[PDB]
């Protein structure tokens, strides 16, 4: 009978893959905009001795549009393993709701399946995907990832687009910093028992709920751990123009008068926002 | 307004008349005993306490049944000739009167009770179960 004041939780958060996207605000629930498809051929070096001229093929144009989406929870009560006194379980539910909202919003904007959701740029499959090269070993072409590949992926981006950062799981970076050469040396940065370069200079933002092709470091591979075919390894894009997140109204909470019969206090809440993709060309995805 | 008094003090069958059941108290620090009768008794009955260790084959199953040694309090007048702990239900206990008990010395990871030999016919009319106090994990 000596209750303490510690409230150990042990629950994890994701990374915030939102500040990279193009943040936009609007009051109305439906927006629209313009697009320049492809200027197109509009002539040729007219040959000599011809005061005439020529025709050809111009480029299309598309005024596009999008909507927002909702996310609302009711959560009632009864008020006597409640209001009496152990803890303000209400605040617990409020915090859990906000955390759930953030995590589900991030998961949606990453993998949102079309209907009533911001179409997840992963499942869109219109970002270019670069499968990796198979690896022969003891007469077996077992899929596997190899240092140069990563570099070849990060350098293969069209430079004239602009600065394109990259995204990956901490498991992938751990597998990467643990690359060992034929000389048993630590293939990458080597000779400090570790490898801690500031990823901001190395233009890499890290996450922990990305598809993690190196599942809890268990999935590596020589013959059974094999990194497994086609598995999102990482991605790279200029997210200031690749994706966009539109914000309409934050979470709101209010008591629902009516239905509440002085014991079942019924609270109502919710939020509205959405997202979409730009042209899914400024950015690619490294897969097995 | 009965609370969910099973998410603490969880009870488990220990002796259903003709079968014992090793119960894990590792998560708990405190555990009592509840004895109940179902019919009329004939003579007094005796029970021997056992405890079990994590089997080398599996760290989540009970091992063998090691007898529990009796720890004496102050002001003790008799000790079991073996020095091993044991309980006994006296005669003339009508089957609407629960009985409580507790050994103050835990050892092992599983506990168990068995009807001491020669006093096992009446054991059929005896029911034993145990509740706990702890979680710790």
């Amino acid at each position: 009978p000596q209750v303490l004041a510690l409230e150990v939780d042990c629950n994890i958060e994701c990374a915030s893959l939102l500040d990279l996207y193009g943040q936009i605000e609007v009051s109305r629930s439906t927006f629209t905009y313009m697009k320049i498809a492809d200027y197109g051929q509009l002539g040729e070096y007219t040959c000599d001795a011809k005061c005439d001229a020529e025709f050809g093929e111009p480029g299309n144009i598309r005024h596009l549009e999008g909507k927002t989406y909702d996310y609302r929870g009711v959560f009632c009560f009864n008020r006597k393993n409640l209001q009496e006194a152990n803890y303000d379980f209400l605040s617990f539910m409020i915090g859990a709701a906000q955390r759930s909202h953030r995590i589900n919003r991030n998961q949606a904007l990453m993998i949102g399946k079309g209907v009533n959701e911001p179409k997840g740029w992963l499942t869109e499959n219109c970002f270019p995907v670069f499968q990796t090269l198979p690896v022969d070993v003891n007469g077996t072409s077992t899929p596997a990832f190899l240092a140069q590949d990563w570099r070849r992926f990060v350098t293969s981006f069209p430079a004239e687009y602009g600065e394109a950062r990259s995204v990956m799981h901490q498991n992938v970076f751990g597998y990467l910093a643990a690359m060992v050469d034929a000389n048993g040396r630590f293939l990458f940065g080597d000779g400090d028992l570790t490898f801690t370069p500031d990823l901001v200079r190395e233009r890499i933002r890290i996450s922990n709920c990305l598809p993690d092709p190196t599942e809890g470091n268990t999935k590596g591979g020589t013959g059974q751990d094999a990194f497994a075919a086609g598995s999102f390894v990482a991605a790279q894009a200029a997210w200031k123009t690749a994706f966009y997140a539109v914000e309409k109204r934050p979470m709101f909470f209010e008591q629902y008068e009516g239905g509440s019969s002085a014991w079942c206090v019924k609270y109502q809440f919710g939020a509205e926002d959405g997202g979409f993709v730009g042209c899914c060309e400024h950015g690619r995805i490294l897969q097995i | 307004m009965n609370f969910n008094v099973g998410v603490d003090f969880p009870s488990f069958i220990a002796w259903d008349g003709e079968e014992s059941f090793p119960v894990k108290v590792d998560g708990f620090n405190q555990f009592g005993f509840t004895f109940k009768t179902i019919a009329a008794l004939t003579a007094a009955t005796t029970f021997n306490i056992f405890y079990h260790e994590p089997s080398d084959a599996d760290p989540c199953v009970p091992g063998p049944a090691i007898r529990v040694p009796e720890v004496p309090f102050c002001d003790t007048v008799l000790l079991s000739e073996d020095g091993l702990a044991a309980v006994t239900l006296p005669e003339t206990v009508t089957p609407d009167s629960f009985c409580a008990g507790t050994v103050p010395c835990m050892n092992g990871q599983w506990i168990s009770i068995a009807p001491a030999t020669g006093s096992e016919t009446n054991a059929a009319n005896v029911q034993i179960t145990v509740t706990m106090k702890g979680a710790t994990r």
Binding site: A178, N217 | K24, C60
Partner: peptide, 28 residues
């Protein structure tokens, strides 16, 4: 109504393996 709730008493936490980059032979 009665939503009978659960928790674990014990478990058998195994040892997750730990595979790390095998050496690369060479492409070709």
């Amino acid at each position: 109504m009665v939503k009978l709730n659960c928790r674990p008493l014990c478990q058998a936490p195994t040892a997750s393996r730990l595979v790390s980059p095998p050496c690369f032979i060479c492409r070709g």
